[PDB]
């Protein structure tokens, strides 16, 4: 894998490929 | 802080796939 740098646009883009339709939902407020 | 160590730093996909839910 590459440096795990994830920021919103990439955060979701990550869980999107890492999870996908599996159902991913990162946090934000908590 | 999944976004912290990940956005404000680096993290591991393992803990990232743990959010699959």
From Swiss-Prot, chain B:
What protein is this chain from?
A: Insulin A chain
Disulfide bond entries: 6-11
Q: Which residues of the full protein are shown?
A: 90 to 110 of 110
Biological classification of the source = Eukaryota, Metazoa, Chordata, Craniata, Vertebrata
Where does this protein have coiled-coil stretches?
Answer: none
Specify the superkingdom.
Answer: Eukaryota
